[PDB]
Amino acid sequence: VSAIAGGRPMYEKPADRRFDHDVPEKRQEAAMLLSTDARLGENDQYVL
Amino acid sequence: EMSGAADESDDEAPAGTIRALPSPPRGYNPAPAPEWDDLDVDPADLVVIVGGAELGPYGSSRTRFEMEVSGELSAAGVLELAWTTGMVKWEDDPKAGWYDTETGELVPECEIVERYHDAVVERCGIREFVDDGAIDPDHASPLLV
């Protein structure tokens, strides 16, 4: 009901979790796909 | 003396009639050591490739694989391509054999390489686009404003 009224339900994502810190995340790009259990923390609002 | 030696030739008699053809394709096994248990693996849960084929710029899977691995066709390579390209035809009319489809001439299996393959290589694989649609993208493509 919050989505229907406000026009909220469609948000096109900037993909923050991908690039979050320019230098390491491009380096961490490999390390993420490689190791199984690496995931998002909720507390930072979905950080990679 | 040496120009003369080069200028003085001679013909050593060579009588040769060569042909090109082969036995049906065989398989060469590889040497592999395997320590295995039999009953352990469920055959119902395994996926196995029974067969396969392709139609592409180099012809079927047989001719394409020859061009990829070798770089040149065998006897069966040119024979198959000349057949697929429609260079050679089969008539039950008298003389009963393989015939050239373009000029209507009887052909054996040997001359297939000599009479065709030069033209086969050009008109197979990658080449300038031959127009079967009466339109050339690169030259002239119909526009309407």
Added chain:
Amino acid sequence: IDLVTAELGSDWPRLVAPTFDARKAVVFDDRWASAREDLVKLWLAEEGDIDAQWEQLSQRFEGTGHVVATQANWWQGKALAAGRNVHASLFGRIAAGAENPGKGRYSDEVAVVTGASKGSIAASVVGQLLDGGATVIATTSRLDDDRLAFYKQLYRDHARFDATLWVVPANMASYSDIDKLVEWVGTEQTESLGPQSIHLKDAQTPTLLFPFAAPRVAGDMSEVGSRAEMEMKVLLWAVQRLISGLSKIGAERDIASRLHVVLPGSPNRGMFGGDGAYGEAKSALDALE
């Protein structure tokens, strides 16, 4: 244009047509890639025993070494087992080659060689320069892939560490080519990536210069008899402009480095009457000195 043709002849205007353009150049700086493929081909095809001098020669060719090529050799060697006699010889020789690779050194030479083609003196010089850890500019008159494939074969054999080879279409008969070539040889050594790909002309100050370019007598256009006149431009005058050209670059870009030009003099003028070409043409090199 009819009068100009009447004086000079038919072949001169047609052969003087421009050839060189800055976009057709090809650079091979990779040893690391070619050395790896070179070793595995040896390892698989090994037949001859340890008594071979080729193994010592190939080891000197495999002397190109860094973290990259070591990671190749040290691996296929460590993966090798005790399975057979060849495996015992390969493993030991490879471990020794892996050790000699770690301490490997290099030299540096910057050379420009013309007339480098197949089955020639200069081709033997080129591979040897590459054997000496040099940087070599190699020119070829025929740009066809059959000539292009040859230099790739020659490089992947005789290349050491620090070795970079350069092959280009070139015509020594064209003054435009000479000016355009050295303008390419002397500019930047820079590669700009914008929206598009622009390679700024590679600048390497030539140490050695080898004008071994050798026109041969082939007269299909009927050019016969006028060639000794035209080659005097090529063998000397155009060399003079070639020497002058690299002198400008050296002076403009301000190097005190001396370009060593080896002048391919013909042996002992006047005591042979049978050569007909070499003996007479190269006696003016004393005048050039």
Added chain:
Amino acid sequence: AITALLQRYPDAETVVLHPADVPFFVELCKTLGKPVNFVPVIDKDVRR
């Protein structure tokens, strides 16, 4: 003689007579000096 030839070409032992070699043999039966002792093919000419 048979052994001498097919020793040189051992593949002749494992393979089919080529589809183009069949008309050749039937053709040779028709041009043979003394008529063939057998019937090479069942066809319209079987009476002949």
Added chain:
Amino acid sequence: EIRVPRKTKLSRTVGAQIPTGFDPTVWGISPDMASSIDRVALWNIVATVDAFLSSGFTPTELMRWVHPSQVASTQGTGMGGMTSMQTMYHGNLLGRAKPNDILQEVLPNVVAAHVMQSYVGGYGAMVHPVGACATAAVSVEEGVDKIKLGKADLVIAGGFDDLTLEAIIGFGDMAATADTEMMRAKGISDSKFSRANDRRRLGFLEAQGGGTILLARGDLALKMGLPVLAVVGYAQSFADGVHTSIPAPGLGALGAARGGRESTLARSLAQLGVGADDIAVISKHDTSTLANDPNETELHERIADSMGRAPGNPLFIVSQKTLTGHAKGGAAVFQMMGLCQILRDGVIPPNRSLDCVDDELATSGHFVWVREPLDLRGKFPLKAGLVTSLGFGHVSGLVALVHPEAFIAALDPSEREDYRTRAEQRMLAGQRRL
């Protein structure tokens, strides 16, 4: 409002095209079929016939061992029916006489539908993936999926696409295709312009064609007594993720190597008693584009790195796109075909279009790019290949292929010997039929 005829000159003068003089008629397709169906249909129809010819001929022989509803058809397309599509949109707007069956014939599924009507006559599953460039490997994945769940015991997997006018102008506009006017300026002949992993790689050559494979249950293949070309140890498609950037290529195919010894890639191998080092060959998508080649290389480099690939035991990689060009739909099947032929013959095909390896690729040590054929004889065996394909819009895929003789080891010596007897008899009868 008037529409007045004009013309345009375009960049692409060359494509990889089926050899001139090809006819479906020579193969024996009736003229009625040739008319009524799209050109793309003639490709998948003949390919299916020749695909069967590898083992059996009469498609109803399958109904001897199997209930017809257990026959499946999984056939991918990037587009498919292209001609029939461009035939309607021209024709209708042009009021020209065009066929009434157009929209039926433009359905990318209708092509193998035509094959099922004309040939197999199976009562079972039909699926038709769209993987863009990756449909072929994506198709294999679902063909594999259909069998293991008992939905169908026999599947046909494959992909096909065509090269037409407006297929070219879409790529050339998208900038993804190599510009021929630039290639001739660099002194590049038509055969040499598709170069994978090369420093000079200018973008992909577009091609046309189709190919298919017959995937079956291992138990059925023994029972029917057909040839075993290879074991499919795994198949997967993989997406990438959220990003704005257009050159940024999908890396998501790495998900198969996740977990190490617990990874899908290694466990697939381990079940055959095969290690990570035992994958000698990877068949890259190798589009020859500047975007795909280094990324797919980094991808294959990393999937090896984490799984504990022994240092400097590099995956020897073939590029078939340098030869056959890039056919969108039938890409990974031609690679699938080549990989089977790699396993049985042992021979690892060269990339003969490679003048120089890209200096960027040096950072990958688990990858080797071979310019000349390494031919493996009887004393030099091989084990397992991997087909990888990256489609448009985060379509990525991986198919692990393993040598047939790994399967024969599960029969016990008595039954193993009994199977070789049947397979030998089939080859002789197969050579006959062919």
Added chain:
Amino acid sequence: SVFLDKDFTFVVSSEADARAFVQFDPEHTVARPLPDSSDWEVTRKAGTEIRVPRKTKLSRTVGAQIPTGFDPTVWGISPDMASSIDRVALWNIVATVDAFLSSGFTPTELMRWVHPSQVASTQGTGMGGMTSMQTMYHGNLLGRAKPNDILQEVLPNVVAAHVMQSYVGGYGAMVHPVGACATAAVSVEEGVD
């Protein structure tokens, strides 16, 4: 398609467009530089092929159509997406969002419980990208300005590819059945598989 019986009156055209004219006709068309304006005159002789506009009346006057006034913009789709993508894409994109809304919202919440490569997309089409297809074959033959991304946007798989790029961002499987009329149920089958 009609053949011109007698030479058409000259018309002014650019050098690039007029040289193109010559590439089709060339015995049948004639083009000249106009010395002052540098442009070219295009004169079609007799024997040229002309395509002349006409019309047709058709049988189907009615269809089942999404309620008039529907906008992907109202749902919150950005204008850049609406432009670049086919109409069919707007259907699958909004539907996917509302499909998630049944349970969770943020597509990355799936990556909390699951490794991203375990997220799959099985999406069927009978044709799909129809607009983008008809847009190229008209546009190209008509030389009208049309988008460069056309062939990418006509791939029946590209629509959910657009959704995976814009929303879920999964690292896992993508399959795109063609079932003609049956794709939907055919898609479920493979989604189950």
